[PDB]
Amino acid sequence: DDWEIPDGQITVGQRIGSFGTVYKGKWHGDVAVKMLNVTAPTPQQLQAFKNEVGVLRKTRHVNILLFMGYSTKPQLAIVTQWCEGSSLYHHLHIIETKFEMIKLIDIARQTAQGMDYLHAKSIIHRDLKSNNIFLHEDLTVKIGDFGLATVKSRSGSILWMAPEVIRMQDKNPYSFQSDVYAFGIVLYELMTGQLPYSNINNRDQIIFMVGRGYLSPDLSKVRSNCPKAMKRLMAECLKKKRDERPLFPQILASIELLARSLPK
Ligand SMILES: CCCS(=O)(=O)Nc1ccc(F)c(C(=O)Nc2cnc(N)c(Br)c2)c1F
Numbered sequence: 001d002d003w004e005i006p007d008g009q010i011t012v013g014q015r016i017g018s019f020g021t022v023y024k025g026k027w028h029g030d031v032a033v034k035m036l037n038v039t040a041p042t043p044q045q046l047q048a049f050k051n052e053v054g055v056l057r058k059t060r061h062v063n064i065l066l067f068m069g070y071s072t073k074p075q076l077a078i079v080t081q082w083c084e085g086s087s088l089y090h091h092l093h094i095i096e097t098k099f100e101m102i103k104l105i106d107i108a109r110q111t112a113q114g115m116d117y118l119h120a121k122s123i124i125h126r127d128l129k130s131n132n133i134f135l136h137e138d139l140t141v142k143i144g145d146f147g148l149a150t151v152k153s154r155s156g157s158i159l160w161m162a163p164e165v166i167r168m169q170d171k172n173p174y175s176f177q178s179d180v181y182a183f184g185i186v187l188y189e190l191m192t193g194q195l196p197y198s199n200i201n202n203r204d205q206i207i208f209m210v211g212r213g214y215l216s217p218d219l220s221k222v223r224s225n226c227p228k229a230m231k232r233l234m235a236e237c238l239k240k241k242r243d244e245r246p247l248f249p250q251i252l253a254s255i256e257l258l259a260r261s262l263p264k
Pocket residue numbers: 016022032033034056064065066067078079080081082083084085143144145146147148
């Protein structure tokens with residue numbers, strides 16, 4: 001049964017990330033390792049980690065980063081598949097990658113696909129954002145960094161945070177819809193190739209404004225080749241009240257419907 005990977009069985013290479021630091025390595029080929037790089041967690045910390053891992057093993061889907069095993073000994077770690085490619089953030093916002101409107105819609109679809117899964121598997125991402133969506137072989141969407149919702153509790157996502165989330169209002173804001181609004185942001189990201197509210201330099205003012213929903217994203221910044229129904233859905237996914245947002249079944253429905261009336 002247990003996916004534990006004993007000491008020496010992994011060989012860590014060059015360094016990548018910086019909530020857990022990410023290393024590339026080799027374990028039956030190239031693999032990603034996120035070492036939690038805490039110092040030495042005591043027996044009831046150990047148990048809650050194993051608890052979070054158990055939420056990963058619940059996952060088997062092409063649009064979901066492949067959980068390949070965890071480590072305890074050398075350090076606490078989660079090993080996944082290594083992706084060839086670059087994050088959706090990196091394409092859109094660093095190397096200014098220009099995607100055909102058709103491939104944009106597919107990435108949308110793929111991403112909504114992965115979510116609809118996690119949601120039926122009663123998972124909530126909590127931090128769905130473009131720097132967290134890989135584009136593999138430049139064709140396949142892999143959602144990641146949604147594990148460990150307990151190990152963190154026990155900043156840099158403000159843009160995707162739904163109102164209810166943003167204003168640190170109650171104990172649990174995070175819903176399925178929370179994730180749905182974060183989707184609306186990635187939708188806007190795709191259809192505009194731009195981060196929202198870029199004409200504002202004072203962070204806190206965003207945080208304030210969104211929280212009160214005086215400031216929402218600017219639909220009218222979508223590139224013209226964006227489908228009429230794509231706009232309608234983006235807007236549907238960004239509604240200020242969370243009960244008004246649709247759930248991934250309906251989102252997926254709407255995407256697969258408009259994409260079929262597209263290349264024609
Ligand atoms: C997918 C479930 C595990 S999780 O904790 O939600 N996410 C998670 C866990 C461990 C990881 F190394 C990663 C990760 O980012 N891997 C990763 C894979 N491939 C590349 N090229 C890079 Br750069 C990073 C990751 F996204």
